[PDB]
Amino acid sequence: SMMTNEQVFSLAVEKLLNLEVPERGQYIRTLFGEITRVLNHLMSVLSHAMDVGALTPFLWGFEEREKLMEFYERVSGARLHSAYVRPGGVSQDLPAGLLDDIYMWATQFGDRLDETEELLTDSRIWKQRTIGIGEVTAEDALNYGLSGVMLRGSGVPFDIRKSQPYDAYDKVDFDIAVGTKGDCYDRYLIRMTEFRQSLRIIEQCCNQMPPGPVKVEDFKVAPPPRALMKEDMEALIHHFLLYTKGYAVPAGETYTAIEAPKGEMAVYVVSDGSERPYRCKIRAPGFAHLGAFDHIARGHFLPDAVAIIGTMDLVFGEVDR
Amino acid sequence: EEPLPVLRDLPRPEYGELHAPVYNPAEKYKEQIEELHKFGRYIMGCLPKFVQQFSVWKDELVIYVAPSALTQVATFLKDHTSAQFKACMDVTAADYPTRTNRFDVVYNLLSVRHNSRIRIKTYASEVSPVPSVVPLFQGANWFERETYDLFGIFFEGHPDLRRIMTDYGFQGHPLRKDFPTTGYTEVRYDAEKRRVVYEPLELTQAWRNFTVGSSVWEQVGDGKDFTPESFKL
Amino acid sequence: TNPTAFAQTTRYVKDSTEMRTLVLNLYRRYLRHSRGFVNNYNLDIPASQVRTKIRQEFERQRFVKDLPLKNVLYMKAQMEFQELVNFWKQQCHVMQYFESIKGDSFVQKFLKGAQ
Amino acid sequence: SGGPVPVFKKYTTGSKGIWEKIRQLLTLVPNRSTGNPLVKNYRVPPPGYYDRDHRRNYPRLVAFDQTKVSGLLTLGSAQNPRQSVSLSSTLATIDPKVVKSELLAEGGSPVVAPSLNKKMKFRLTEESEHGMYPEDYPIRIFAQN
Amino acid sequence: PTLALTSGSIQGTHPEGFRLPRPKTWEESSESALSKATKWYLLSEIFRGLYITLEMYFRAPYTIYYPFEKGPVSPRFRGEHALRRYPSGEERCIACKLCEAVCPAQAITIEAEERIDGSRRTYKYDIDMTKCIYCGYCQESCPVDAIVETPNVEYATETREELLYNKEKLLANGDKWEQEIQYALDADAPYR
Amino acid sequence: STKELTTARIKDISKPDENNLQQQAPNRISPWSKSQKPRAEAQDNVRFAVKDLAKQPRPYAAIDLIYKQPIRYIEHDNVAVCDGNGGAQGHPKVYINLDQNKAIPCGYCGLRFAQAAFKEDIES
Amino acid sequence: TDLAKELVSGAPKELITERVARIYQETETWKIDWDILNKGNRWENDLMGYQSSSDYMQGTILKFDTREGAIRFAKGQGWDYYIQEPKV
Amino acid sequence: ATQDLPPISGYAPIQWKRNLPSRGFRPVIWFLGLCTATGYGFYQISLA
Amino acid sequence: SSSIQRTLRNLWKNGFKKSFKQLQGYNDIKSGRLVGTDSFGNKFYEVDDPVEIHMRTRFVEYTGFWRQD
Amino acid sequence: PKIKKAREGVTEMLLENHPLDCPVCDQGGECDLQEQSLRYGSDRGKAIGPLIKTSMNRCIHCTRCVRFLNDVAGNSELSANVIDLCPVGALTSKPYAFRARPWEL
Amino acid sequence: FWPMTFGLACCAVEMMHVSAPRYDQDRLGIIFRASPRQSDIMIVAGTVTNKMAPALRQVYDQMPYPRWVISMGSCANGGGYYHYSYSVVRGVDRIVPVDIYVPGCPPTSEALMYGVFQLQKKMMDGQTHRMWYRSY
C-alpha cells in the first residue's frame, strides 16, 4: 500500500502548510487511493487464502497486481515505490490515455472477484478454517485500539474515510461493510466487499474526473515547469531554492489519520519552523493488531495461529517502522 | 453481437481558461475551532484540579496534565458519557532537551461513539515516572514499550515493559536528540571467532551534514487569527 | 493478554531499604541459573566462571546513590535477567558479552597515532 | 448500477466462431471473460503573490490556561460582554446562571464531544439494492443515507 | 436542536433496523433435511469449485518468455543512472551540487573545480548504486538534464565493487544509452 | 612519456592515439583539470592486475569535442543568445555581451561567439 | 546536576571523558557539538576518495533555546564542555 | 485536447455487484440419480 | 494462443533451422515479420498472429545458440 | 496588505535583466537576491584582478563595490573585501571559483 | 534452481511476482523451498538489520554444499536507504559471501530474473570434476 502511505504524510504536511490541493489533484489521489487498496487487499486476502492452503487464488490475483502495477509505473516510473503523492498535490500529471486503460481493466476486473468468491466464499473447507476463529468483541476491539477491518468485523460501523473526509472522498459514494461475529470469515467478507466498493469508486473517479492543475501553483512548495524554469528568472530561483534548502513548515503539531488498507494509519509530526521535521511518529495499524495477538489467539490451535495472522494483514515493514 | 468501441476515438471536451480558487483553508474550520474550545473548557470545568491548560489547532484538541494527573484525566475521558474516548490510538513521545522535563508523552484517544479525538499531553523527565495507562487501555501495552525502548521513559505500572524495537542487548535509547543517527557500533562476521560479532562503528563514507546552508532569515510570521470571539477577553 | 515468563510490574519504589532487599534476591537469581546459562548458550566457560563474571558485574556498580536512579538500574537489570533467562539473546551475544577485554606511555601513543 | 454485463461489453479476449457457442454451453457463467486484455485496443499507442498565499496566514498557536479561562466567565466575551487567578476558587464562588450559558450549553446540558464530521449518518441497506451477499451471510452493508 | 440535552448526538443514533433479528432454529430452514444432506454428502460446492478451476485450464496463460520478450516500460521508468552529453560533445553537467543535496540516500558525490578552458565542470562524480534508492530526484533536479535514469535494469554484477559508478562509467552509459534516453525524454516532454 | 600524462595542459603537443590505453582519453593525452588524477596513475593499482584494460570505460574527452566545433558568429549585433540549441530540453537562456574583442564561450554549452566586424580579428 | 545520569543514557564511556562539547551560538539560539578527534576524524578512502570517519559524533548538533538550558543539559549528562561567548 | 480527460458521455457502467448464479439440478434430482445408479448397478451385479 | 494449431503454423513457416533454434532457447515455436537487426546481431521480430497475448507481440532471436544474455 | 506590493515591486524590478546563472553562480547558494526574492517577492513571472572574478552581468548595482573603495581601503591591499560585501554573485572570488557550495562547507 | 524464501522487506514483493503467472519462475525449474536443507540458493531480499544478522548466519551455514547467495536490492547490497541507521547492517556482504548483486529499489521482476540468469551462466561454467584431473 504505497500511495496510501505517502498520502498520510502528504496530508500531514499540507495540514501544517495551510495549503490545499486543487480539485484534479485530489481526484488523482482518490483514484490511486482505490487502486492501492485493491493492490493491498490482493496481497492480504490471497496470502491469507494461500497460508490456509488455497494456492490457486493467490496466482489468479497476482496477475491483476501485475496489471495494476502497470498503472503505478506509467504515472510515476517505478513499479512498486511510487514517490508520486508529494506534499502539495501529486508529482506529475496523468499520462494521456491512462483513464482509458484504467477503465478497461475495471470492466475485466469485475469477474476476477467472482472466481475468487467461487473457490473461497461458499467452500466448506474455507468456512471451517475461519468461522469462529479469532473472536474479537466490539467492546474489546476498542480497548486494544484496533482499526480497519478488525474493527468492523466486530460490528462497529466506523470508517475514517467518512469520519474525516479527505482528498475527494466526500465527492464519491460507496458503502462500508460491517460484520456481526468478529471472526476471520467475517473479516474475509468485509475485505471482499472492499474489493467491489473500491471498484465502484474507480468508476466514479474516472467519470467525475475534473480538469485543471495537479499540484498547488505555489512555486515555494512545488517545482516550476521546465518550460518555465529556463525562461523565467523567478521560476529558476524557486527551482534552485526548493532542491537545496527545501521549504519551511510553520511551527505546530498535527495528527492526521487516514483509512489505510490495514486500518487507521496516522503520523504525528511536529514542525519546528525548519525545513526538516522535528518529530515524526508513525501509527502503524499492523503494529497495534499484532499486540492484540495474545487476546485473540488464546485458546485456539496451532493451525488457527496462521489464520489469525493472515486476517491481521501483517506487513512487518510497517510494524517495525 | 456488436463490436466494442475504441476509447481513444471517443469525442472529448476541450478546456481552456482555468480559475482555480485560492482562499484560506482555515475558513472550513470556522465552526470546528468553535466547537472544540468549549469542549476543552468543559473538561477543565469537570476537571479544574488536573487540566493545566489546553489549545485547539484547527480540528484538534489538546489536554495538558501533569504525570500525577494523567490516569485521572484519562479515566474521566474514557468513562464519562459526555466524552467516551474508548480507544487509545497512539502513545508517542518526543525529546526537547532544553526543558527540565525534556520528553513530552502524548496520548491520542478515539471516540467511536461521539466521533472525535483528543490529545492528552503529559511531560516526563529522564527519571520522573509516568503512570501506565494499561488499567484503562490494554492497547498501550505495545505503544508504551516502543516509547520506553526509543526514549528510556520510565512508565509506572506497566505489566511488562522491555525492549520491543531495538536489538537484544542494545545500549542506549535511539530517538533522543543526543543519540547519534549512525549509532555507536555495527556488526560483522569474524571467521576466526566463527560468529557474528559487534564492533565499534566505522563508516567508509561519513554522513555529510548539509544543514549548514540553512535559512538565516525568517520564513513565517504570526499569521491570521481565527479564534472565535466567544473565547476572548 | 497474559504476561510472559519472569515478568514484574514497573513500579517507582519510594523506599531506600526495600530496594536493598530487592537487589539481594536478584543477585541470587542469577547465581541459581548459573548452570543453565552454560547449558542454554553452550558457553565455553564453566559454571564457576559465569558466577565469577556475574560477581564482577554485581560488584562493579554497588556504590550508586540516587534512589530515582536506583529504580532505573533495577528496572533495566530486571530486563537483562528476563531476556537471558527466557533464552532470548542469541548465542553470539552472550559469548561476546564475556569476551570483552593496562595503558601505554606517551611515546607509544605519539608514534602510532594516539586517538 | 453494477448489474451483470455480457462478455462482448468487456475489453477482453473473446471467442470467435462455433467455439463461442461451445463456451456458452460448458462454462457455468457465460458472461465472464478470460481476463486477457485486448491486444488491439489496450495500450496500443504507447506513451510515445499575496492574493494567492496562505502559508504565511496559517492559524496561530494560542494556549488557554487557568488564568485566562477564569476571565471568560467573569468579564464575559469579546462578542457578548458581561497573574495567577485560580479557577477552582472561581467555581466555588460564582453564579450558576453564568455556568448555564458559558461553561455549559443548552441549560447546563453537557457538551457532546464535537463531531469530526456531522454528516456521518448511516442507514441499513438491503440485498436488492447493493447486490452483495444475501441475508444469511454474517455481514451487513451500511451507506451514507 | 441537537441531542445535547440528553448528552447524545445524531451521530450516536444507530440507523433504523440496526439491531439483529432473531436467529433461526432447526425448524426454520428453507431447504428440507434431504436437500441439505444431498448437498452435504455429495460435495456440491467442491465439485462446482473444481469445475471453475477447470475453466482456467482452457484459457491462455499470461506468461511471457524472458529474456526473449520483455514486459512493458514507460517513458518515466527509473532505472540506471546515466550522465548525459550535449550534441556538440561538451558535458551537460556544470556541477551544481544540486545533485549532492537532493539525493535522499546521499548516493551522489561531486567534486569540481575550474577546467583548463575555465568553463565550470567536475572531475569527480560518483554514484553508490548500492546506496541509491532509484528515487528519481537525479533527473528532476537537473537544470540541464545532465543526469537521467535510463530504462535499463539488466546490469547485475558479480562483485559489489563494480556497482560504484565513477564519472567515466556514468559517461560511458550516457553515450551508450543516448538514443534510448531520446525516446524517454521526447515522450515525457509535455508533462514536465 | 611520463611527463605530459601526469600534467594538466591546454592542448597536447603530440598527436593522440585512440589505441593507447595509458592516455587520459582516446582523443587526449594530458588531463584537463589540475586535480584530476591521471589515468596512467590510476590503472597502476592492485585491482587492474588481471582485469583487461581494453574493456574499461574510456569515454572521449569533453574538452576536445567542443574545440572541434567552429565558432558561431553574430552579424550586426552585440548580444548573443544561446539556450542549448535544442529547444526546450536545453540550458537556461543566457545573453552574451560581445563588447570584448575575442571569443566568449557560452555559460553551459561552451559554444563561442563573435561579431561581424571582429570576424577577421578574432580568427587570427 | 548531582545525578549520575550517564548510567541510564547508555552512552559509551568515551563521551564522559575523552570528548569535548562546544556550546556556541551561530543568532537567537544556542547549539552543542563535539570537537573533532585528534586523528581518524577524516581519512581519505583509498578506493573512491570517500570522506571516511570513525568519529560517531561528527554529524550531531543539538539546537537549544537558552544558554542556561544548554548548560543544564551538559551537567545533567555529565559532559565536559566549554562555552563560547559571541562577539557583540 | 492537451490533457487526459474522460469523454463527455463518460464510459459505460462496469459490473461490480456480486454475480454468482447457481448451477446444476436440484439436490433431490441428484439424490434420485444416486439411487437409480445404485438401483441399476445392483441389477447388473445380480445378473452377473 | 497455446494450442497445437498455432505451434504447427509457426513451425511450418519458419522452417526447421530457425524453429529448432527456438526449440533450444525460446521453448515456444513462434513466427513473425522480421523488423531488422541491431549492431550486435540480434534479429527483432514482430508477430502478426491474432492469437498472441498482449505482451508477446514483439520478441527477439539472439545470435547465440546455447546461451542468451 | 498594501505594503507587501513594495517587496513585490522591488523584487520584480531587480530580476528584470538578471542572468539565469543560479546553477553556475560561484556563490549561488547564499546570495541575498534569491533568499530575498522568496520571502518577500512573488513567485511567477572586464576583469579587475587575478583575485576577484568580476561579472557585472549579475550586478544589481548599488555601487557598494564603489562606496567601500573610496571609504575604507582607498594595487589595493584590501580590495578583496569587495567580494564579501556585494550580496549578489556579481563579484565573486576567483581562487575559490567553481569549487564548493555553501550548503556543504 | 531452488532458492529459499528469505523475503524480509519491500524487496520481497518482487520476488513473489516472479512466481506470478506473468513470469512464472516455475517454468525455469525454480521451486522455492522453505527449509535451508532443501534449498541450494538463498535470495537475501530486504534490509538486514543488526537484530537479524546473527540469525541470517545460522540460516546460511545450514545449506549443504554447493550453495549460492544472491543479494537483491539496495539494502542487501550496501545498505541502501538505511545506510546511516543505528540498527541496519550496511550491506549483507559483511555476514555472508555473495555471488551476484541485483541493483534496484526494488529491482524489477525482470532484473531479478536477469540476476538469476547470470548466476546460472556461472554455474554452467563450473569445472569441479575436471579440476581434480588437471588442477589437483
Ligand SMILES: CCCCCCCCCCCC(=O)OC[C@H](COP(=O)(O)OCC[N+](C)(C)C)OC(=O)CCCCCCCCCCC
Ligand atoms: C449415503 C450418501 C453417501 C455419500 C458418500 C460420500 C461422502 C463424502 C463425505 C461427505 C461429508 C462431508 O464432506 O462432510 C464435510 C466434512 C465435515 O463437515 P462438518 O464437520 O459436519 O461441518 C459441516 C456442518 N454443516 C452440516 C452445518 C454443513 O468436512 C469437510 O468439509 C470435508 C471435505 C472433504 C473434501 C474431499 C475432497 C475430495 C474430492 C474427490 C473428487 C475430486
Ligand SMILES: CCCCCCCCCCCC(=O)OC[C@H](COP(=O)(O)OCC[N+](C)(C)C)OC(=O)CCCCCCCCCCC
Ligand atoms: C455424473 C455426475 C458426477 C458427479 C456427481 C456429483 C455432482 C455434484 C452434484 C451433487 C450435489 C447436488 O445436489 O448439488 C446441487 C447443487 C446446488 O443446486 P441448488 O443450489 O439447489 O441450485 C439452485 C437452483 N437451480 C437449480 C435453479 C440452479 O448443484 C450444483 O451446484 C452442481 C454443481 C455443478 C457442476 C457439477 C459437476 C462438476 C464436475 C465435473 C463433472 C462433469
Ligand code: SF4
Ligand atoms: S536516483 Fe535519487 S537516490 Fe538514486 S542517486 Fe539519484 S538522487 Fe540519489
Ligand code: SF4
Ligand atoms: S543537477 Fe545536472 S548539472 Fe547540476 S550537478 Fe546534477 S547532473 Fe550536474
Ligand code: SF4
Ligand atoms: S546572484 Fe543569486 S539570483 Fe543572481 S544568478 Fe547568482 S544565484 Fe542567481
Ligand code: SF4
Ligand atoms: S556591490 Fe554588487 S550589487 Fe552593488 S553596485 Fe557593485 S556589483 Fe552591483
Ligand code: SF4
Ligand atoms: S532496497 Fe528498496 S525495495 Fe529493497 S528492501 Fe531496501 S528499501 Fe525496500
Ligand SMILES: [K+]
Ligand atoms: K557575494
Ligand SMILES: [Zn+2]
Ligand atoms: Zn549555450
